[PDB]
Design a protein around this ligand. Structure first.
Ligand code: MET
Length: 526
């Protein structure tokens, strides 16, 4: 197609409470996608951040008896600390309190208004403050609040809903039904997974109401962006929030990660529109309906892909999963592996300690770690080098073919994107490499047929190198330890050139050994 910066985003999270696993998972997926495109040698801009305005946040700050400025700044700081500890490679962390962001929101608003797509009207209806979401009466039901009093709750989330009757600026969303439908039909990969795409089409097929994009300022505790030309109104937190993707695309960022300039025209930085928006299923409508509608109105290009995973962007009754405690217990790369291996586009995942140990011991230690140790062992690799292969048998070639096919396959999965499938494909090949090794018994060959061992060892090292390269966006620190052990030069650790079989030449020396070297140490079953 065209050469631009591959632009991948995560949602920006409400700062009403501390960061937790949902946020870490969403930002993980964004990080992995970005990392894979970097190892393909593409330019990448990965974006994450915090949603800091609105009633929900203001009221959370009121509950803690602190000013919104101090509260948002403190919780935003917790998010940054958390993501730093998680060892992501995110290019920029945006906050909607940022002054440049507010300028962008005002430019976008003025466009919608000049286009004729904003009018003064009224919203009279249900609203979820916890989700900052307007709801029809079909999407609420009966429940209770903390006081046990009967109340209405959202069908979507189970949060308490309230009736709102306000003069509001309205966006003409109803006018964009046909164009949104055209967009879904013409780009059948634009929403992932496919069943969520089908949900969006059905919802839009039914018809769209107009959307309130302002609120009376008192309702918001004056914690929002004023509407241009009307200081009695505040911009809807979601229109403000979605705009973070446009803002991010227009920020020049220095080496320490501070924003230093806002460009006038997004084309200047070549990021917009996003190639992938990573979201949780709870915020699908905002990204797949509202967002493209605003862009169509403003005449901005639309995103290429929205991927909605099965977790809730935001969710205690005596049940905890602390990301850092787990990572300090089992390792950071292992935890990341586990989260991405275990969960597809569903809540069907088993996140017990029992299952974590099984995958750690089974896949990372027994399948991958053991293979790395065998092909670098002094016992088997007596000369500590990549040997030069002799002639290949049919069995050799069957394995070589699997290895040559693997890049093209994982690449497709990464681009869906479906990271779980990309992992399963790589491990299928690791399993095949192990079976080959068992078959050939290279420990026996050292004594018996040194020439045969050359071939078997070479194919093993090259299968390990390639699988590891493809696993490196998922296991960034361990992929480095593995490449060091194999003695793979830095240049061969990225680029599509190095997807090819045979990229590291024979005679390459292995890295230095360490006594009792741990790649993935097993954990007892308790
Ligand atoms: C533009 S994405 C906004 C997401 C929302 N703030 C949330 O936390 O769920």
């Amino acid at each position: 197609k065209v050469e631009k910066v591959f632009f991948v985003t995560s949602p920006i999270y409400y700062v009403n409470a501390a960061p937790h696993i949902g946020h870490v998972y969403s930002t993980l997926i964004t990080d992995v996608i970005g990392r894979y495109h970097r190892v393909k040698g593409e330019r990448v801009f990965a974006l994450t951040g915090t949603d800091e305005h609105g009633q929900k946040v203001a009221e959370a700050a009121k509950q803690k008896q602190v000013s919104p400025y101090d509260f948002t700044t403190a919780v935003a700081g917790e998010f940054k600390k958390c993501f730093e500890q998680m060892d992501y490679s995110i290019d920029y962390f945006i906050r909607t309190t940022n002054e440049q962001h507010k300028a962008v929101v005002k430019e976008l608003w003025t466009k919608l208004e000049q286009k004729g797509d904003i009018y003064l009207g009224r919203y009279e209806g249900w609203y979820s403050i916890s989700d900052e979401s307007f709801l029809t009466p079909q999407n609420i039901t009966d429940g209770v609040d903390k006081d046990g009093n009967p109340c209405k709750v959202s069908l979507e989330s189970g949060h308490v809903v309230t009736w709102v009757s306000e003069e509001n600026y309205m966006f003409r969303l109803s006018a964009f039904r046909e164009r949104l439908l055209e967009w879904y039909h013409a780009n059948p990969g634009c929403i992932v997974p496919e069943f969520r795409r089908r949900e969006v089409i059905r919802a839009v097929e039914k018809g769209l109401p107009d959307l309130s994009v302002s609120r009376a300022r008192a309702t918001l505790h004056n914690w929002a962006i004023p509407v241009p030309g009307n200081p009695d109104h505040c911009v809807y937190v979601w229109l403000d929030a979605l705009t973070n993707y446009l803002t991010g695309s227009r920020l020049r960022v220095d080496e320490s990660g501070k924003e230093v300039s806002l460009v006038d025209d997004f084309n200047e930085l070549e990021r917009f529109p996003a190639d992938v928006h990573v979201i949780g299923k709870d915020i699908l409508k905002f990204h797949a309906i509202y967002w493209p509608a605003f862009l169509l109105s403003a005449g901005l290009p639309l995103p290429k892909k929205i991927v909605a995973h099965g977790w809730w962007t935001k969710d205690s009754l005596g049940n905890v999963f602390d990301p850092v405690e787990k990572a300090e217990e089992f390792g950071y790369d292992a935890l990341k592996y586990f989260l991405l291996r275990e969960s597809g586009f569903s809540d069907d995942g088993d996140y017990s300690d029992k299952n974590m140990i099984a995958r750690l011991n089974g896949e990372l230690a027994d399948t991958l770690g053991n293979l790395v140790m065998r092909c670098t062992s002094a016992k088997i690799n007596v000369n500590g080098e990549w040997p030069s292969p002799a002639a290949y048998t049919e069995e050799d070639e069957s394995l070589i073919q699997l290895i040559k096919d693997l890049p093209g396959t994982a690449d497709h999965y990464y681009l869906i994107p479906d990271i779980q499938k990309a992992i399963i494909a790589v491990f299928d090949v690791l399993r095949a490499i192990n079976a080959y090794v068992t078959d050939m018994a290279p420990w026996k060959l050292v004594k018996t047929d040194p020439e045969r061992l050359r071939t078997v060892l070479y194919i093993t090292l090259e299968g390990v190198r390639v699988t590891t390269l493809l696993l490196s966006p998922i296991l960034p620190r361990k992929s480095v330890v593995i490449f060091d052990m194999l003695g793979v030069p830095e240049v061969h650790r990225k680029g599509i050139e190095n997807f090819e079989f045979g990229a590291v030449p024979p005679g390459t020396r292995l890295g230095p050994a360490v006594e009792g070297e741990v790649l993935f140490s097993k954990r007892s079953t308790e």
